[PDB]
């Protein structure tokens, strides 16, 4: 009955119901006027012409290696590019945040409640005639049918980009500090009240948890030594709550920041590496500041590890992910003369677009072995078995699956995929073309254009009927990958804004924070500005094994 | 001890201890370089020369009333100015926030814990030799001696500016939504987790409290009708907790947003006026939006009242306070092409500088009466006695005390003043000249320059000895008032930045929020853009009693 159910306003214009069956579009600052915000203004038309498509830019960012090789070695030229990357993106995010799963109109409740994941697009009204508004049938296609016909993997499809397991598990370990759905409340709720890279997955969300994990001497994190190796402490010794099946022996129940990282040895691998790093830097700091106490050493280390993480995520992780020939740069100063909000609010859609389960292989091969999911889950004996060096070497060698090709979701994890579909419908998500339009992308006109092939398209067309009814989540895993790329345009176009906003949006990147003193001086500052996923492994893993985010 | 105990780093430089007996200053982006960041850079020296003192600017703004009359009628000219007052100020605030009562160095704990009041200047180290660092004696002068010698009022000193009781109580009611010290934790802790004008003093901090106060029909707030007049509901009917002495009759225990507003009829006066306004606007909104439900009407109303509040505080309240001939303007758009952080963190110092108790008279005269403090406190029968119209008329006529003259703190409220002194020492505050320097002011060279007279100066000099040991809080109440002004330069220079930051820092002022649709259309937007203390008291109190913030 909601007259705005039809998503009338185009170009970021706000729909407001003016009477029981009439509406109105607020075209303020949209660049257009007209009942529906579609009549462009003069200056708008000019910017529309000189605007290259995302796929055009991606092409230039990934081609002409010889050229990028030049730009890449011209400090001022290289800064000029990155600054444009960092800004051109950010304007797509609403900050301060707007809607959430319960509010399709701006309200204080929405803006102030930190328990909610924010929303790029308002949910579909509850009194709308169809799930996606007015188009389609009273009900979306069976999620199980969608799951089986185009999502479940028959044969393992490797990633053309070379993404290995150090990459897959890094993304998992990292994204899991801000993606912590509060299942007790609902899918649109989060437990990561920091809404970003606060490294609570190492230190804990609560002060109470943080103090249980702390040694309280030299600012160090409690740990244990097994077979001459440093690993996280046990739950029996720290009292911090972790999620472990009832059959796990107390001496294997490791206690880390994130209560769920004990369920996957790959997550516990990074957990140990970052614990080792925290205390490593603690020694560096005490060395320079013999006058410093335990609290100030611990606090400053955490600030440094946050900076190292932002550094690695932008120069290693995303660097590999993007496939750009342009060398990304983590330099908060590039935004200092720009208009930018040093704040963030984790989006639900970002969380949805990040369910990269197709990444996982059919077996985890560490050294001589080949473990099935059943054997890998909650099994830290495996880690204690081969050791961090073996894990790093083995996972650096194992290729991970492609994400956007289609039909590559491991069957061992199909429940997770079904739920992604279901919960998205539960949170009244808007269609894939609604989100495409929202992120300055051209809506797909057919299922064949979306997939780039004929079979899955046929399958989808028989399930949904309208391409304008197609759902976001599945569409992302089935989208036509970019040339030899792991992702489609929608994945990269939605994820980059949300990503940089939370990476650059961090307080430590603000002017008052970006300076030596904040990190204990030029020695601490340097740790950050020189961080690499390689030096992260080298300094903490025995044998300084070689590591990379791609199958060498 | 610390070696940084003596505040060596000048010009906002950061002191970081570099060894048991050595220190260093991070002069990053300060404009100065040198072991103590005192050596100005070139451009710095040019800017200095071309920067008029706070007292110069003040003078220009409170004079040339003819010029001001012109500018004030040249839309773009006025805009030009106000934008300058908006921006020129804001750069003095650290945002995102930095220190708190427990952290003198930036830490994540400091930046993430919302339970703390932030701090404009780091507290003095606990291992410092003296209370203010290195200067002065092991102990500051007796607070009771300070209290009695220069703070307690012998004869009531009226405010030369004409401030009446509608002003004094307005400031109290308003400032009490973000100044809510959590005494269970300590002075440096707050309960106003919104850190700004979120109008929790009307709606409640918690959703639980908010729902107890809500009618749940037309988005209205519960209320009661007494003698044909609308008043807040009772605690017996809503179950919301309020602070009332044991002898107050249930039928007098009014339930409002702020649990403490039942302790002063002046506070409960504004409480009723703003409750009346919320439902008033609810009627306006239902009129335009028959299709809207209770939740959307209530939520939109609250967004409108927040806007009205920001409008009135800047164009009525501050307008009167400043004494400027320049007409202030509340227009979030003036910052749209500027670099500004749409966020805030209530400062402890702001809270301290706002203890305007000298404002209160010796008796509250409503109509024929003259009530002593003893009779006025927690007495809502008085309100029910004379009514809102009588309170508005009476309080608009009664002059309020001067704040900066010296010796004008009502004796009926001396405990409050003593504590302000104590708690400030408790939170390890820095000296008055430290804060003056921090806010681009020139430190006072003598107690006579601070007070502008000889007696109180002599009294203070005998108590503190060094002007560089002089405490902030007392200094504010004893400072030489500006010509016929209610405040001194330190008061206006510290408060303005903290003030606009939280007023302009509100989300509703952000681009995504500043548009008709957010406020239910052009009708709701208009309510905000044409708000004033006159129309507030005019659409809500019987007879539309004339009202103003100054004695007519
Ligand atoms: C080691 C294999 C993995 C297992 C056993 C696993 C299992 C799961 C399960 C059971 C959930 C809950 C899903 C739901 O109910 O909605 C989940 C959520 C999630 N997984 Fe995985 N996952 C694995 C690897 C990954 C990887 C490598 C990524 C991609 C970077 C990933 C990203 C996500 C995301 C973003 C969520 C939601 C996080 C949250 O809100 O709590 N997962 N996964
Ligand atoms: C109507 C008579 C008033 C009484 C009986 C009164 C009483 C008090 C009391 C007992 C406190 C706690 C003091 C402490 O121990 O720190 C307080 C705090 C305060 N008062 Fe008043 N006051 C009155 C009027 C005002 C007015 C007119 C203002 C002017 C803005 C004002 C501003 C403050 C401030 C800013 C605080 C701090 C609140 C907090 O941090 O939680 N008061 N007052
Ligand atoms: C952010 O929004 C959340 C979602 O609404 C809020 O969580 C809900 O808070 C309600 C009020 O506290 C809870 O209501 C229940 O109502 C019954 C009947 O009045 C009470 O008896 C219950 O005690 C009360 N709580 C529970 C657990 O039943 C909701 O249950 C609760 N959870 C959900 C999923 O809605 C958050 O409170 C809010 N956060 C803040 C800071 O306001
Ligand atoms: C913001 O900072 C506040 C001040 O540090 C935190 O409040 C403190 O949290 C502590 C840990 O929860 C409490 O410590 C007490 O320690 C004993 C010994 O371990 C425990 O048994 C107690 O249960 C625990 N709490 C109490 C009430 O005894 C402090 O008491 C508590 N209060 C103060 C004034 O320090 C806030 O938790 C923190 N906020 C967030 C969101 O992290
Ligand atoms: C009539 C007003 C006289 C003001 C001068 C006060 C000088 C210090 O006088 C103080 O006054 C306080 C208020 O009663 C008392 O509680 C103190 O005991 C008293 O020392
Ligand atoms: O940066 C991340 O958090 C990973 C990620 C996930 C989804 C989409 C994009 C990205 N990263 C990313 C970024 Cl941040 C910029 C440009 C291109 C890419 Cl693919
Ligand atoms: O604006 C307030 O909240 C009151 C207040 C208190 C202390 C200091 C300044 C102000 N207001 C104020 C402001 Cl916000 C700007 C310019 C001039 C003045 Cl006096
Ligand atoms: C927008 O386009 C026209 C009005 O210009 C009208 O036909 C249409 O219904 C409007 N909205 C939608 C969703 O079509
Ligand atoms: C766990 O790992 C150990 C050692 O690698 C292995 O022997 C055991 O079978 C595994 N347990 C399960 C349930 O897979
Ligand atoms: C700053 O002034 C000089 C160094 O330029 C030195 O004598 C002094 O100790 C420094 N610090 C302070 C607090 O004076
Ligand atoms: C409260 O107010 C009433 C009515 O105005 C007055 O008669 C009474 O004396 C007051 N009570 C106290 C304790 O002051």
* Secondary structure string (H, E, C) spanning B85-98: HHHHHHCCCCCCCC
Q: Look at residue B399 and give its three-state secondary structure.
A: strand
Q: Look at residue A219 and give its three-state secondary structure.
A: coil
Distance from the Cα of residue A98 to its chain's centroid: 20
**Considering only CB atoms, which chain A residues are within 8 Å of B339?**
338-339
Q: Concatenated DSSP letters for B40-52?
A: E-HHHHHHHHT--
Instruction: State the nearest Cα–Cα gap between A171 and chain B, in angstroms.
Output: 23
Whose CA is closest to B221, among B187, B254, B252, B195? Answer: B254
For a pocket test of ligand 10, which of B4, B8, B134 has the largest count of ligand atoms closer than 8 A to its C-beta?
B8
Could you tell me which residues are beta bridge partners of residue B224? B231
Whose CA is closest to A105, among B302, B503, B193, B177? Answer: B302
DSSP B306: H
Full 3-state SS string of B218-249: CCCECCEEECCEEECCEHHHHCCCCCCCCCCC
Are the beta carbons of B401 and B156 closer than 8 angstroms? yes
Element of type H or E holding B141: none
Element of type H or E holding B32: strand B32-33
Q: Give residues with Cβ within 8 angstroms of B230, minimum separation 6.
A: B223, B224, B272, B275, B276
Q: Which ligand is nearest to the CA of B426?
A: 2
Residue A90 CB coordination number (10 Å): 20
Residue nearest to atom 17 of ligand 3 (CA): B208
Q: Are residues A471 and A342 in the same domain?
A: yes
Say whether the peptide bond before residue B96 is cis (omega within 30 degrees of 0).
Answer: yes
Are the beta carbons of B372 and B363 closer than 8 angstroms? yes
CA distance B424 to B443: 20
Q: Are residues A412 and A475 in the same domain?
A: yes
Half-sphere exposure of B238 (CA within 13 A, CB side): 29
CA atoms A224, A227, A230, A235: torsion sign: negative
Q: Mutation target for B interface from A9, A111, A344: give the one with most B CBs within 10 A.
A: A111
**Considering only CB atoms, which chain A residues are within 8 Å of B341?**
341-343
Instruction: Tell me how the structure was determined.
Output: X-ray
Element of type H or E holding A165: helix A165-175
Alpha-carbon distance values, B182 to B113, B189, B457 (Å): 14, 5, 35
Is B324 annotated as belonging to a binding site? yes
Could you tell me which residues are beta bridge partners of residue A152? A409
Counting beta carbons within 10 angstroms of the beta carbon of residue B216, is it exposed (0 to 12), middle (13 to 18) or buried (19 or more)?
exposed
DSSP A40: E
Q: Are residues B46 and B36 in the same domain?
A: no
Q: What is the CATH number of the domain that holds A31?
A: 2.10.25.10
CA distance A167 to A164: 6
Q: Are residues A2 and A146 in the same domain?
A: no
Whose CA is closest to B440, among B494, B483, B495? Answer: B494
Residue B523 CB coordination number (10 Å): 16
CA distance B6 to B134: 6
For chain B, how many helices (H) and strands (E)? 24, 8
CA distance A96 to B198: 14
Q: Which residues of B467-490 are buried (b: 16+ CB within 10 A; e: fewer)?
A: bbbbbbbbbbbbbbbbeebbbbbb
A108, B299: Cβ pair inside 8 Å? yes
Which contacts qualify for B280-284: CB closer than 8 Å, 24 or more apart? B280/B539, B280/B540, B281/B305, B281/B524, B281/B527, B282/B218, B282/B219, B282/B220, B283/B218, B284/B523, B284/B524, B284/B527
Which contacts qualify for A29-36: CB closer than 8 Å, 24 or more apart? A29/B511, A29/B515, A35/A8, A36/A8, A36/A9, A36/A10
Cα angle, residue B12 at apex, residues B11 and B13 outer, rounded to 5°: 90
B299, A515: Cβ pair inside 8 Å? no
**Closest by Cβ to A198, choosing from B20, B112, B299:** B112
Alpha-carbon distance values, B94 to B38, B178, B526 (Å): 21, 18, 33
Element of type H or E holding B100: strand B99-100
Whose CA is closest to A416, among A183, A140, A122, A163? Answer: A183
Half-sphere exposure of A472 (CA within 13 A, CB side): 35
Q: Are residues A219 and A346 in the same domain?
A: yes
Q: Are residues A65 and A33 in the same domain?
A: no
Counting beta carbons within 10 angstroms of the beta carbon of residue A458, is it exposed (0 to 12), middle (13 to 18) or buried (19 or more)?
middle
Q: Are residues B8 and B133 in the same domain?
A: no
* Residue B499 alpha carbon to ligand 7 centre in Å: 6
Q: Give residues with Cβ within 8 angstroms of A7, minimum separation 6.
A: A15, A133, A430, A434
* Residue B317 alpha carbon to ligand 9 centre in Å: 71
Q: Look at residue A164 and give its three-state secondary structure.
A: strand
Helix, strand, coil shares, percent, chain A, to 5: 45, 10, 45
The separation between the first and the last C-alpha atoms of chain B, rounded to the nearest angstrom, is 57
Q: Give residues with Cβ within 8 angstroms of B524, minimum separation 6.
A: B281, B284, B285, B288, B300, B304, B516
Whose CA is closest to A268, among A250, A247, A245, A242? Answer: A242
CA atoms A236, A238, A243, A244: torsion sign: negative
Whose CA is closest to A276, among A528, A549, A542? Answer: A542
Radius of gyration (Cα) for chain B, nearest Å?
A: 24
CA distance A136 to A122: 19
Q: Look at residue A319 and give its three-state secondary structure.
A: helix
For B254-334, where are the alpha helices, taking DSSP H only? 265-288, 294-312, 318-322
CA atoms B413, B417, B419, B423: torsion sign: positive
Crossing angle for the helix pair A522-529 and A294-312, to the nearest 10 degrees: 30
Are the beta carbons of A381 and A147 closer than 8 angstroms? no
CA distance A341 to A2: 34
Q: Mutation target for A interface from B103, B107, B199: give the one with most A CBs within 10 A.
A: B107
Q: Look at residue A26 and give its three-state secondary structure.
A: strand
Domain extent for B355: 42-552
Counting beta carbons within 10 angstroms of the beta carbon of residue A447, is it exposed (0 to 12), middle (13 to 18) or buried (19 or more)?
buried
For B333-413, where are the alpha helices, taking DSSP H only? 348-353, 373-376, 380-397
CA distance B263 to A480: 67
Q: Which ligand is nearest to the CA of B386?
A: 11
Counting beta carbons within 10 angstroms of the beta carbon of residue B128, is it exposed (0 to 12), middle (13 to 18) or buried (19 or more)?
middle
CA distance A300 to B107: 7
For A217-264, where are the alpha helices, taking DSSP H only? 235-238
Whose CA is closest to A427, among A190, A196, A203, A204? Answer: A190
Radius of gyration (Cα) for chain A, nearest Å?
A: 24
CA distance B511 to B335: 9
CA distance A36 to A11: 9
Counting beta carbons within 10 angstroms of the beta carbon of residue A339, is it exposed (0 to 12), middle (13 to 18) or buried (19 or more)?
middle
Whose CA is closest to A92, among A440, A416, A484, A540? Answer: A440
Whose CA is closest to A358, among A452, A491, A459, A199? Answer: A491
Element of type H or E holding A79: helix A75-90
CA distance A35 to B337: 27
CA distance B202 to B180: 14
**Closest by Cβ to A14, choosing from B16, B96, B517:** B517
Are the beta carbons of A298 and A202 closer than 8 angstroms? no
CA distance B15 to B4: 6
Are the beta carbons of A210 and B124 closer than 8 angstroms? no
Element of type H or E holding B133: none
Whose CA is closest to A474, among A152, A186, A135, A125? Answer: A152
Q: What are phi and psi of A307, to 5 degrees?
A: -70, -40
Are the beta carbons of A329 and A82 closer than 8 angstroms? yes
Whose CA is closest to B170, among B308, B352, B286? Answer: B308
DSSP B359: G
CA atoms B200, B202, B206, B210: torsion sign: negative
Are the beta carbons of B78 and B327 closer than 8 angstroms? yes
Q: What is the tally of structural domains in chain A?
A: 2
Is A320 annotated as belonging to a binding site? no
Q: Concatenated DSSP letters for A184-218?
A: TT-TTBBS-TT-S---HHHH-SSHHHHHHHB--ST
CA distance B267 to B257: 11
Residue B80 CB coordination number (10 Å): 12
Element of type H or E holding B140: none
Say whether the peptide bond before residue A96 is cis (omega within 30 degrees of 0).
Answer: yes
CA distance B387 to B407: 34
Whose CA is closest to A220, among A295, A326, A323? Answer: A295
Whose CA is closest to B404, among B359, B465, B449, B471? Answer: B359
CA distance A142 to A463: 8
CA distance A173 to A175: 6
Instruction: Choose, from A173, A176, A201, A320, the residue flagged as catalytic.
Output: A176
Q: Are residues B407 and B526 in the same domain?
A: yes
Q: Look at residue B254 and give its three-state secondary structure.
A: strand
Whose CA is closest to A525, among A536, A513, A533? Answer: A513
Half-sphere exposure of A491 (CA within 13 A, CB side): 25
Whose CA is closest to B48, among B32, B29, B69? Answer: B32
Q: What is the CATH number of the domain that holds A293?
A: 1.10.640.10
Q: Are residues B26 and B104 in the same domain?
A: no
Whose CA is closest to B378, among B463, B288, B488, B261? Answer: B261
Whose CA is closest to B120, among B509, B503, B508, B499? Answer: B499
CA distance A189 to A179: 10
A95, B510: Cβ pair inside 8 Å? yes
CA distance A369 to B502: 60
Crossing angle for the helix pair A75-90 and A489-504, to the nearest 10 degrees: 100
Whose CA is closest to A329, among A338, A319, A339, A342? Answer: A319
Instruction: State the nearest Cα–Cα gap between B98 and chain A, in angstroms.
Output: 8
Residue nearest to atom 13 of ligand 8 (CA): A8
Q: Concatenated DSSP letters for A114-153?
A: TTB-EESSPPPPTT-SBTTBSSS-SSPPPHHHHIIIIIB-
Q: What are phi and psi of A492, to 5 degrees?
A: -70, -35
Alpha-carbon distance values, B104 to A463, A519, B24, B28, B109 (Å): 61, 14, 15, 18, 12
CA distance B88 to B82: 10
Whose CA is closest to A265, among A410, A386, A355? Answer: A386
Whose CA is closest to B281, among B523, B530, B533, B541? Answer: B523
Q: Are residues A370 and A394 in the same domain?
A: yes
CA distance B321 to B130: 37
Q: Is the CB of B400 under 6 A from ligand 2?
A: no
Q: What are phi and psi of B15, to 5 degrees?
A: -90, 130
Alpha-carbon distance values, B275 to A395, B202, B280, B283 (Å): 63, 7, 9, 13
Strands B99-100 and B118-119: antiparallel
Q: Are residues B177 and B31 in the same domain?
A: no
Q: Are residues A253 and A371 in the same domain?
A: yes
Counting beta carbons within 10 angstroms of the beta carbon of residue B241, is it exposed (0 to 12), middle (13 to 18) or buried (19 or more)?
exposed
């Amino acid at each position: 009955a909601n007259p705005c159910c039809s998503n009338p306003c185009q170009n970021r214009g706000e729909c407001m119901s003016t009477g029981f069956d009439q509406y109105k579009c607020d075209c303020t600052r949209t660049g257009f006027y007209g009942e529906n915000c579609t009549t462009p203004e003069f200056l708008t038309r000019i910017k529309l012409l000189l605007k290259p498509t995302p796929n055009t830019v991606h092409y230039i960012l990934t081609h002409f290696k010889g050229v990028w090789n030049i730009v890449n070695n011209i400090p001022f030229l290289r800064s000029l590019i990155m600054k444009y990357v960092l800004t051109s993106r950010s304007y797509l995010i609403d900050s301060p945040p707007t809607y959430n799963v319960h509010y399709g109109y701006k309200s204080w409740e929405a803006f102030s409640n930190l328990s909610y994941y924010t929303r790029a697009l308002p949910p579909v009204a509850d009194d709308c005639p169809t799930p996606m508004g007015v188009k389609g049938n009273k009900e979306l296609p069976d999620s199980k049918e969608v799951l089986e016909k185009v999502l479940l993997r028959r044969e393992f499809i490797p990633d053309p980009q070379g993404s290995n397991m150090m990459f897959a598990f890094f993304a998992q370990h990292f994204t899991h500090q801000f993606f912590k759905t509060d299942h007790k409340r609902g899918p649109g709720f989060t437990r990561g009240l920091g809404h970003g890279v606060d490294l609570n997955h190492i230190y804990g969300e609560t002060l109470d948890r943080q103090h249980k994990l702390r040694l309280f001497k030299d600012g160090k994190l409690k740990y244990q030594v097994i077979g001459g190796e440093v690993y996280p402490p046990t739950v029996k010794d720290t009292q911090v709550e972790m999620i472990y099946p009832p059959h796990i022996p107390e001496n294997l129940q490791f206690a880390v920041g994130q209560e769920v990282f004990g369920l996957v040895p790959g997550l516990m691998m990074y957990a140990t590496i970052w614990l080792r790093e925290h205390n490593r830097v603690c020694d560096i700091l005490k060395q320079e500041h013999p006058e410093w106490g335990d609290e100030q050493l611990f606090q400053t280390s955490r600030l440094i590890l946050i900076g190292e993480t932002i550094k690695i995520v932008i120069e290693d992780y995303v660097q590999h992910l993007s496939g750009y020939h342009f060398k990304l740069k983590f330099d908060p100063e590039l935004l200092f003369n720009q208009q930018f909000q040093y704040q963030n609010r984790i989006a639900s859609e970002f969380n949805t677009l990040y369910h990269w389960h197709p990444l996982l292989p059919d077996t985890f091969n560490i050294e001589d072995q080949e473990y099935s999911f059943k054997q890998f889950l909650y099994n830290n004996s495996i880690l204690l078995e081969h050791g961090l060096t073996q894990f790093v070497e083995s996972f650096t060698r194992q290729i991970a699956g492609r994400v956007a090709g289609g039909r590559n979701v491991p069957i061992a994890v199909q429940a997770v995929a079904k739920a992604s579909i279901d919960q998205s419908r539960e949170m009244k998500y808007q269609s894939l073309n609604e989100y495409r339009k929202r992120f300055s992308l051209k809506p797909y006109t057919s299922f064949e254009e979306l997939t780039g092939e004929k079979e899955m398209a046929a399958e989808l067309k028989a399930l949904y009927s309208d391409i304008d009814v197609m759902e976001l989540y599945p569409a992302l895993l089935v989208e036509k990958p970019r040339p030899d790329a792991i992702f489609g345009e929608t994945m990269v176009e939605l994820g980059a804004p949300f990503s940089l906003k939370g990476l650059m949006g961090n307080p430590i990147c603000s002017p008052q924070y970006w300076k030596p003193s904040t990190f204990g001086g030029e020695v601490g500052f340097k740790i950050i500005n020189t961080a690499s996923i390689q030096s992260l492994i080298c300094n903490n893993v025995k044998g300084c094994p070689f590591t990379s985010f791609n199958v060498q």
